[PDB]
Amino acid sequence: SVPWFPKKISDLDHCANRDNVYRKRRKYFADLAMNYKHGDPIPKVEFTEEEIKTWGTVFRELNKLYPTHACREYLKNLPLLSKYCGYREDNIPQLEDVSNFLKERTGFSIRPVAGYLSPRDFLSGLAFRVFHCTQYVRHSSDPFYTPEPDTCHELLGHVPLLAEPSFAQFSQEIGLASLGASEEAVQKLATCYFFTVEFGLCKQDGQLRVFGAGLLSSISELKHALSGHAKVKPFDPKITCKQECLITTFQDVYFVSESFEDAKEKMREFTKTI
Numbered sequence: 407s408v409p410w411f412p413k414k415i416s417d418l419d420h421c422a423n424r425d426n427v428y429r430k431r432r433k434y435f436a437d438l439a440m441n442y443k444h445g446d447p448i449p450k451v452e453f454t455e456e457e458i459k460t461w462g463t464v465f466r467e468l469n470k471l472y473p474t475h476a477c478r479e480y481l482k483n484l485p486l487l488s489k490y491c492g493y494r495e496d497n498i499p500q501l502e503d504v505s506n507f508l509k510e511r512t513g514f515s516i517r518p519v520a521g522y523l524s525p526r527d528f529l530s531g532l533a534f535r536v537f538h539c540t541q542y543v544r545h546s547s548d549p550f551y552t553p554e555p556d557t558c559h560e561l562l563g564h565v566p567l568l569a570e571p572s573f574a575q576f577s578q579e580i581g582l583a584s585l586g587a588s589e590e591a592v593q594k595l596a597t598c599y600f601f602t603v604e605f606g607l608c609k610q611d612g613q614l615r616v617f618g619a620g621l622l623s624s625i626s627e628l629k630h631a632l633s634g635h636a637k638v639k640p641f642d643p644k645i646t647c648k649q650e651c652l653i654t655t656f657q658d659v660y661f662v663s664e665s666f667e668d669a670k671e672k673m674r675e676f677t678k679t680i
C-alpha cells in the first residue's frame with residue numbers, strides 16, 4: 407500500500423528526529439535539534455573560539471579555490487550570503503539567518519537536525535523545500551575533510567546553490583519523486599542526489615566545475631576532484647543510480663552534468679521509469 411510520508415511542511419516534525427568537551431558540546435546541538443518544532447525560529451548559537459577558528463580555516467582556504475573550482479551559480483550567490491548572512495572568516499553564520507535569506511530567494515528553508523536521517527526522511531524534506539542541516543562544527547583535527555556532515559558543509563556546500571531557482575527546483579523534484587516511493591526507488595533517487603547535489607561536477611564554457619556540496623565544503627576533495635587524477639563519467643541516472651556512494655573516503659568516480667536545467671530533465675525522464 408503506500409508507506410507514510412509528510413503531506414505538509416509541519417509533518418516533518420514526525421520524522422526529523424529519527425574528548426568529553428567535544429562530546430558534551432555535540433549533545434548541546436543534538437538537544438537543540440530534538441526540541442525544534444516547525445514554526446520555531448531556529449535557535450541561535452554562540453560558537454566557541456575553537457569552533458570559529460576551525461570555520462575560519464575552512465572558509466579562508468575554500469575561498470581561495472572557489473573562483474577557479476566552483477560553478478558560476480555558486481559564485482554568483484556567494485557575495486549575497488556574505489552581505490546579508492554574516493559569512494566571514496571570524497563569524498559562523500546562523501541557520502535562522504540563512505533560512506530567512508533562502509525563504510525570500512527560492513522559498514527554501516532550514517530545519518536543524520541532530521543526526522543522520524534516512525534518505526527517505528531527508529528527501530521528503532526537499533519536497534517541501536526544507537533542508538535538514540547540522541548545526542555543529544567539524545572536529546578541529548581535520549578541517550580539510552570530515553567523513554560526517556557538519557555546519558560548514560551545510561553553510562558552504564549547500565546554501566549558496568539552494569539560493570539559485572534552477573537548482574532549488576531540481577532539488578525539490580527529487581524530493582517530490584521520493585514521496586511514498588518504493589525502497590528501491592528511494593535508493594536510486596538518493597544515489598542520483600548523491601552524484602549531483604552532493605558530489606556533482608558540471609561543464610561550463612567547456613571547463614569542469616564543481617557544484618557538489620560535499621566537494622565545496624572539503625578543501626582536499628575540492629582540489630582532488632579537478633586535479634585531475636579523478637575518474638569522471640557523464641551523468642545518466644539509469645547508470646549513475648547503481649554507483650556505490652562512498653563514505654569515509656574520497657569518491658572513486660564523479661559525474662558530470664551539462665547544466666542544472668539538463669540534469670533536471672534527465673531526472674524527469676528517469677523517474678517515469680521507476
Ligand SMILES: Cc1ccccc1-c1ccccc1CNc1cnc(-c2ccc(C[C@H](N)C(=O)O)cc2)cn1
Nearest residue numbers: 525550551552553554555559596597600620623624651
Ligand atoms: C548509505 C547510507 C547510509 C545512511 C544514510 C544514507 C545513506 C545513503 C543512501 C543512498 C545514497 C547516499 C547515501 C549517503 N548520503 C550521504 C550524503 N552526504 C554525505 C556527506 C556529505 C558531506 C560530508 C562532509 C565533507 N566530506 C566535508 O569534508 O566537507 C560528509 C558526508 C554522506 N552521506
Ligand SMILES: [Fe+3]
Nearest residue numbers: 555559619620
Ligand atoms: Fe550534504
